[PDB]
Amino acid sequence: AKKDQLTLRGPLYGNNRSHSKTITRRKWNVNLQPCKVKTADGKTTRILVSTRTLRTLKKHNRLS
Amino acid sequence: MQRIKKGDKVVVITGKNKGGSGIVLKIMPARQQAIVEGLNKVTRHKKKDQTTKRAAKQSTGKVQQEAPIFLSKLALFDQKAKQQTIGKIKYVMDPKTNKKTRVFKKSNNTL
Amino acid sequence: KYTGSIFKRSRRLGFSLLENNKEFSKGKKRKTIPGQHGNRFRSSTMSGYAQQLQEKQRMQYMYGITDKQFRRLFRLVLKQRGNLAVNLFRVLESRLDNIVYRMGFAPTRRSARQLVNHGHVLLNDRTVDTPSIILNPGDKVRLKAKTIKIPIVKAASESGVVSPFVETNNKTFEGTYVRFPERSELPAGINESYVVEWYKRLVK
Amino acid sequence: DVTNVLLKPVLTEKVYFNQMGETKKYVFVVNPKASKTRVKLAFELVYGIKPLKVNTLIRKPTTIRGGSRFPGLSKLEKLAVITLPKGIAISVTGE
Amino acid sequence: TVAKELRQKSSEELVKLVIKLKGELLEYRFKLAHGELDKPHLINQTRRLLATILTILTERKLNWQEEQAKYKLLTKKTNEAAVNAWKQHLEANKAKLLKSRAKREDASKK
RNA sequence: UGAGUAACGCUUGGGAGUGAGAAUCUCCCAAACCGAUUGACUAAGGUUUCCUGGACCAGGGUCGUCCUUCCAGGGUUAGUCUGGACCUAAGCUGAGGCUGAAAAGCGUAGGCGAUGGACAACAGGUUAAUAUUCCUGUACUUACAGUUAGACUGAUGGAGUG
RNA sequence: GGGUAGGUGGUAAGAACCUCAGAUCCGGAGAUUUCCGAAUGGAGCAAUCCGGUAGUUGGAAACAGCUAUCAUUAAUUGAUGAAUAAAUAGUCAAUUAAAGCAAUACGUGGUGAAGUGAAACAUCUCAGUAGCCACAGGAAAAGAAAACGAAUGUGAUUCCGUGUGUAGUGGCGAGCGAAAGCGGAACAGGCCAAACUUAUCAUUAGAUAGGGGUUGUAGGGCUUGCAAUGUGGACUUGAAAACGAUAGAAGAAGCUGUUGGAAAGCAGCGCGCAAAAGGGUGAUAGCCCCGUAUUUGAAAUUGUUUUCAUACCUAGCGAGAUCCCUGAGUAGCUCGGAAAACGUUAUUUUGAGUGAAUCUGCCCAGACCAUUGGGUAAGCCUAAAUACUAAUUAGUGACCGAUA
Ligand SMILES: [Mg+2]
Ligand SMILES: [Mg+2]
Ligand SMILES: [Mg+2]
Ligand SMILES: [Mg+2]
Ligand SMILES: [Mg+2]
Ligand SMILES: [Mg+2]
Ligand SMILES: [Mg+2]
Ligand SMILES: [Mg+2]
Ligand SMILES: [Mg+2]
Ligand SMILES: [Mg+2]
Ligand SMILES: [Mg+2]
Ligand SMILES: [Mg+2]
Ligand SMILES: [Mg+2]
Ligand SMILES: [Mg+2]
Ligand SMILES: [Mg+2]
Ligand SMILES: [Mg+2]
Ligand SMILES: [Mg+2]
Ligand SMILES: [Mg+2]
Ligand SMILES: [Mg+2]
Ligand SMILES: [Mg+2]
Ligand SMILES: [Mg+2]
Ligand SMILES: [Mg+2]
Ligand SMILES: [Mg+2]
Ligand SMILES: [Mg+2]
Ligand SMILES: [Mg+2]
Ligand SMILES: [Mg+2]
Ligand SMILES: [Mg+2]
Ligand SMILES: [Mg+2]
Ligand SMILES: [Mg+2]
Ligand SMILES: [Mg+2]
Ligand SMILES: [Mg+2]
Ligand SMILES: [Mg+2]
Ligand SMILES: [Mg+2]
Ligand SMILES: [Mg+2]
């Protein structure tokens, strides 16, 4: 599914309000961008993660 | 235990037959009736049927048998007493044999 | 929804946030939890009332009461004549199982209550199954004969041990009283009267 | 082995027609789950003479007592036609 | 009542009992299907006694087929007529077989 | 009520017999239609409707002693026939895997899937009902073991044929 | 175990048996339990077909009986091992769990309309309803203040009444509609992270396993003393006792006459009652029968409570130092949505982006600033009152009585 692999945070369903307040259901998708990290002997394994998690990995020295 | 068993003398206290003394030949507990010899004589109109070795003859005319009677209409008959009378029974347990025994309540006669 | 492999993600980070929140190290604390909670008390500085609360706890435990029942009994005794500091003591001590424990046929008050609930207990103008009836100063409590048919008997002895506000003859199973317990027979475990004022604020 | 695969012998016009003239043919009803080899083995261990060959019949269940207040189906039968060699004739009853 | 008597018995005697009652059960069912069974209640008594015997044998962790497979005794009596018929059949078969090949061989030689 | 009205949905005569009762049932003799078919063998489907005896509640567009109706009993025999234990086409399923809010969709290796390919039995007789199946006669094929003689045996793969 | 003198289930007579060495029957505990079905050796058109492996018995072998085992995924462990040395991917084996169903009922979460109303209709309503899906449980959810809110105030959550159809919110239209406070049901608060310290990992630990700690009238750690050996739990194993549940035992009291096929009706004279509930008995029976009130009883299984011991948690008030710790892609902010009564806004939440501080700190009291005051976010668990009845036992009906 279109979801992160580190966390379980997925899409967010909501309303598409326009002028005249017409209601149409829409979906916000998370920015799943590929990322490589070093775990278990630094073994890089591409993992589709959200940019938010990408920032977290970068600050946590993990992303190297 | 049971008020009426197979063998003891019994009489009828209601119906067309009053004071009819007899011996219980068989007791059906589920439908609460009792076959007593000499009482409730019914005469089935015996037809003729021939489809078996015994049915080849099956000689049956005006055979008079026994009709079942409700146990409520039955009452135990006293024998030990010099003046026999009809009464109700208890369920005393004598410690001599530790076995339940029927005893009348208007006298002290066992069974 | 796939091969989540908690090892894969947990080790993937080794600290992170989700990792540490879940950190299987998660012990049992299954004895820490119970006991400390159990029941506490002490007195503080800013409200004073701390003393009242602790004393209330002690009194309720001494007789095995729920706070709601206590509020009911205080409401009952509150209205009558005047300074009723002699009435509510009799009310708190008029419990049937309380009388049964001071009567001496049970090792402990709650055990006596269990007996009462199990239908051991015979009264005068009535009988009894509920362990909460308010008894009158001069009332009898004839004990059953079935309980004696189960000789554990050890009790009868306690009966004589007694406390002066209870007059019960051992073995013969009978009890009544007069001159309701004075404060001496209500020892210093809970002997204060500002718990009364605590309930006056909390209960109208 | 257990010998529950020999339920009941059956005697009809066809059975008696075969059961005469040198080689005898005995028709039994057998377990519907049994195979020809099991039938031969059961006959071996309980009679003692090896069948020359075995034939099998499956009679399908059919509606019976139609129109009666409660209708009912038939029962599944597997028939086996054993044929003993020339000159041997054993009795189905009497052992 | 009956279970006590069988309980007194050993295991080996019990498996002998089961084979004898199994055989007797087959005979009763065959005789009933041929209409020569005067006593039709013996089917139930054998089956109940058979079921009872199974109960005592299953208290201990022992089966009835495997235990009899380890040791047993063979059969007898049903042998003479069987071999006479079989010997006759193979002799007839060999005569036809020999005759057929001879006919074919001399025909091909000619 | 319409109303005992419309309708009763392509096929004749007679003799003998049964029976309480016969245009309608049985037998016989004709007669009239089908005859690239109303004839015969089977696939699909139907599921006992097949044979024998009995019955005439109901069904049969009339009648009925009679029926594909009802009752009781019986009837379907395979190493070679039709299909599995052999093989694949369209297509289906499909561990991993990919995709997708969830349910799920797609899909690899494998596995199914004949309407096709490979594979050894023909003639006659027999019962009321089965017959390349039962019987007679004459054959063939594939496995396993022993034995004789000869020969070095050669596939889960390659190639040819199919 | 109870309990007897009958029994072989109903349409059901007969034939033939069983049963007083205690049958049938009732209760507790077990045995057997074909095939399909989550179906799980492989397949498949459900109740069918085709097997492998390891044993054992017959055969001269093929083979045939009789047993046990053989699905997938996830976790742990061990062995083997590619591109490519090492190492992984992968492969294999062993152990432990998961699959599914139903209670036409309750819970949570995700998704989510339309008929309709507004006398049309698009904002709105219907309605976060129906439906679809996932996960349970015997309840679930919620839960211990970065709170309400305006005071010399209350002090987890949940549910009921009121506050009230109030403040408010609405093409200010149709409509929607709380949060405080008050009265009640029940009541319970707990535990980690970090400091500090111990031991071990080529100790590059930034990791593992322990001691220490759990906060707001700030708490804890650092150093130094006094008082403590207790009280209590949402608590483990046992032992004992009590109250029950799953069969049962005992259980009072009436005759005569009349109409009548039949009395129990009617009449006369009686009797019993802790039993006058009910059913049957040839009409309408307290005293004909079975029962009911009442007194009782369990070998075996099981429920609740109590007693004793036993593990495992749990403890106060000072002094000095002025040092350290208190949950970060977090709270805020911007751009689009939503939750709350609110049609988006102080508070809550998040798809994209950015991004703090560290008790003289941070958040809140309906924009916002200052004063005052309240509270300690970014970690976890939590019984009770609450929701429902497919089922078991007892019972009731100004509920129905074969078109209901
Ligand atoms: Mg809309
Ligand atoms: Mg066949
Ligand atoms: Mg009409
Ligand atoms: Mg007319
Ligand atoms: Mg006309
Ligand atoms: Mg006309
Ligand atoms: Mg006409
Ligand atoms: Mg016509
Ligand atoms: Mg004509
Ligand atoms: Mg012509
Ligand atoms: Mg034709
Ligand atoms: Mg038919
Ligand atoms: Mg016919
Ligand atoms: Mg006929
Ligand atoms: Mg007619
Ligand atoms: Mg042949
Ligand atoms: Mg195939
Ligand atoms: Mg074909
Ligand atoms: Mg034919
Ligand atoms: Mg017994
Ligand atoms: Mg609309
Ligand atoms: Mg409208
Ligand atoms: Mg309208
Ligand atoms: Mg919960
Ligand atoms: Mg009791
Ligand atoms: Mg009794
Ligand atoms: Mg009585
Ligand atoms: Mg009555
Ligand atoms: Mg704010
Ligand atoms: Mg809203
Ligand atoms: Mg502060
Ligand atoms: Mg904090
Ligand atoms: Mg109805
Ligand atoms: Mg009707």
From Swiss-Prot, chain A:
- Keywords assigned by UniProt, alphabetized: Ribonucleoprotein, Ribosomal protein
The record's similarity note reads: Belongs to the bacterial ribosomal protein bL28 family.
One GO cellular component this record assigns the protein to is: ribosome
Under Pfam families, the record lists: Ribosomal_L28
The organism encoding this protein is Mycoplasma pneumoniae (strain ATCC 29342 / M129 / Subtype 1) (Mycoplasmoides pneumoniae)
Q: What is this protein called?
A: Large ribosomal subunit protein bL28
Q: What domain of life? A: Bacteria
Q: Where is this region: Disordered?
A: 1-20
**Keyword Ribonucleoprotein among record annotations:** yes
Q: Name one GO biological process term.
A: translation
Q: Name one GO molecular function term.
A: structural constituent of ribosome
UniProtKB/Swiss-Prot annotation, chain B:
| A GO CC annotation given for this chain | ribosome
GO annotation terms (biological process):
translation
Where, if anywhere, are coiled coils annotated?
Answer: none
Short name of any one Pfam family annotated for the protein: KOW
GO MF term set: rRNA binding; structural constituent of ribosome
For the region Disordered, give the residue spans.
Answer: 43-62
Entry annotated with the keyword Transferase:
no
Keyword check for Transcription regulation, yes or no.
no
Q: Which UniProt keywords apply?
A: Ribonucleoprotein, Ribosomal protein, RNA-binding, rRNA-binding
InterPro entries recorded: KOW, Rib_uL2_dom2, Ribosomal_uL24, Ribosomal_uL24_CS, Ribosomal_uL24_KOW, Translation_prot_SH3-like_sf
- Function field: One of two assembly initiator proteins, it binds directly to the 5'-end of the 23S rRNA, where it nucleates assembly of the 50S subunit. One of the proteins that surrounds the polypeptide exit tunnel on the outside of the subunit.
Q: Which family does it belong to?
A: Belongs to the universal ribosomal protein uL24 family.
NCBIfam families named in the record? rplX_bact
Assembly, per entry: Part of the 50S ribosomal subunit.
Tell me the protein's name: Large ribosomal subunit protein uL24
Which organism's genome codes for this protein?
A: Mycoplasma pneumoniae (strain ATCC 29342 / M129 / Subtype 1) (Mycoplasmoides pneumoniae)
UniProtKB/Swiss-Prot annotation, chain C:
GO BP, sorted A to Z = ribosomal small subunit biogenesis; translation
Pfam families cross-referenced by the UniProt entry: Ribosomal_S4 (PF00163), S4 (PF01479)
Which keywords does this chain's UniProt record carry? Ribonucleoprotein, Ribosomal protein, RNA-binding, rRNA-binding
Entry GO MF terms = rRNA binding; structural constituent of ribosome
InterPro entries documented for this protein: Ribosomal_uS4, Ribosomal_uS4_bac-type, Ribosomal_uS4_CS, Ribosomal_uS4_N, S4_RNA-bd, S4_RNA-bd_sf
Q: Where is the S4 RNA-binding domain?
A: 94-155
SS bonds (residue pairs): none
Query: Entry's SMART domains?
Result: Ribosomal_S4, S4
- Name the GO cellular-component terms: small ribosomal subunit
User: Belongs to which family?
Assistant: Belongs to the universal ribosomal protein uS4 family.
Q: What does this protein do?
A: One of the primary rRNA binding proteins, it binds directly to 16S rRNA where it nucleates assembly of the body of the 30S subunit.
Q: What is known about its subunit structure?
A: Part of the 30S ribosomal subunit. Contacts protein S5. The interaction surface between S4 and S5 is involved in control of translational fidelity.
Q: Which PANTHER family match?
A: 30S 40S RIBOSOMAL PROTEIN, SMALL RIBOSOMAL SUBUNIT PROTEIN US4M
What's this protein's name? Answer: Small ribosomal subunit protein uS4
Curated annotation (Swiss-Prot), chain E:
For this UniProt record, give its keywords in alphabetical order, as a comma-separated list. Answer: Ribonucleoprotein, Ribosomal protein
List, alphabetically, the GO terms of the cellular component aspect. cytosolic large ribosomal subunit
Task: Give any single GO term for biological process.
Answer: translation
Q: Where are the transmembrane segments?
A: none
Chain residue ranges for the region called Large ribosomal subunit protein uL29? 1-84
Which stretches of sequence are listed as region Unknown? 85-110
According to the UniProt entry, its GO molecular function terms are: structural constituent of ribosome
Q: Which PANTHER family match?
A: 60S RIBOSOMAL PROTEIN L35/50S RIBOSOMAL PROTEIN L29, LARGE RIBOSOMAL SUBUNIT PROTEIN UL29C
What family does this chain come from, according to its entry?
Answer: Belongs to the universal ribosomal protein uL29 family.
Entry-linked NCBIfam families = L29
Q: What is this protein called?
A: Large ribosomal subunit protein uL29
State the organism of origin.
Answer: Mycoplasma pneumoniae (strain ATCC 29342 / M129 / Subtype 1)
Give the taxonomic lineage as stored in the record: Bacteria, Bacillati, Mycoplasmatota, Mycoplasmoidales, Mycoplasmoidaceae
Gene, per the UniProt record: rpmC
